[PDB]
Design a protein around this ligand. Structure first.
Ligand SMILES: [Pt+2]
Ligand SMILES: [Pt+2]
Lengths: 148, 148
């Protein structure tokens, strides 16, 4: 079961307001108007949603997922995409995925890890990033999904 | 633009775990598995989502909306449905709507008010309720939508 969807406008995306690096396109999602974040090109890819432990139930396993598409111009996905959940104590769930082997122009969902809240509140960060000196191009971001 | 969708499983719904008063049905929403909350009957209708000011951007006008359906067995909607946003300082946005005049078996969206965050964090409550000694029956709840 899906408890929340968070759209990229709610994310902190480095360069997201820079038109030479990122685009925004309005589109319909099951009657709701959302904006997809479309990466043209960056060296510094960093996309981080912020929600609060208090937004969730305690002692329940949550999984997080981000739905993306590679464009026809997709490139530089040979480097590891770092996946992260940061809990309010600073502890993290850390992962890695290589996108170079994926087919373009189809939505797929990347899992970014599982968490549980024991002992209640504080920021919880949901992100992916790659900071290497190579160009990442042509990733479109639909939504963060949080399940339990 | 829609920043978040919150599904009723994330809400605090009085009697929601009581099978004599409420039902849960799994259904598809633009590829995501959600559970609709279906009210059979209560006298005490109370449905309240909790998110944190920190989940939003400051100095930006947000509107909140809840998508519902009246069933074929819909009843007791002649009383005012109280709509509420409670900010972290305790201040509220308060509204009222009468559902008795609405057609059943079609999704519609109820606006529950607008807010802006000036001076940052704390619980923000999104709810509707009616506590009168009358039976409310046959309301299905899809999702809270938060826009800016
Ligand atoms: Pt992200
Ligand atoms: Pt509600």
């Amino acid at each position: 079961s899906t408890h929340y969807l968070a759209f990229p406008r709610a994310s902190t995306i480095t360069w997201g307001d820079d038109t030479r690096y990122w685009s925004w396109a309005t589109v319909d999602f099951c009657s709701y108007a959302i904006e997809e974040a479309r990466l043209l090109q960056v060296s510094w890819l960093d996309c981080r949603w912020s929600m609060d432990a208090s937004d969730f139930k305690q002692d329940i396993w949550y999984n997080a997922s981000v739905e993306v598409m590679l464009t026809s111009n997709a490139s530089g996905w040979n480097v590891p995409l770092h996946l992260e959940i940061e809990l309010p104590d600073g502890s993290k769930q850390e992962s890695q995925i290589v996108l170079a082997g994926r087919q373009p122009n189809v939505w797929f969902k990347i899992p970014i890890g599982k968490f549980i809240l024991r002992g209640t509140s504080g920021t919880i960060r949901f992100g992916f990033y790659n900071h290497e000196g190579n160009w990442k191009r042509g990733l479109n971001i639909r939504t963060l999904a949080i399940q339990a």
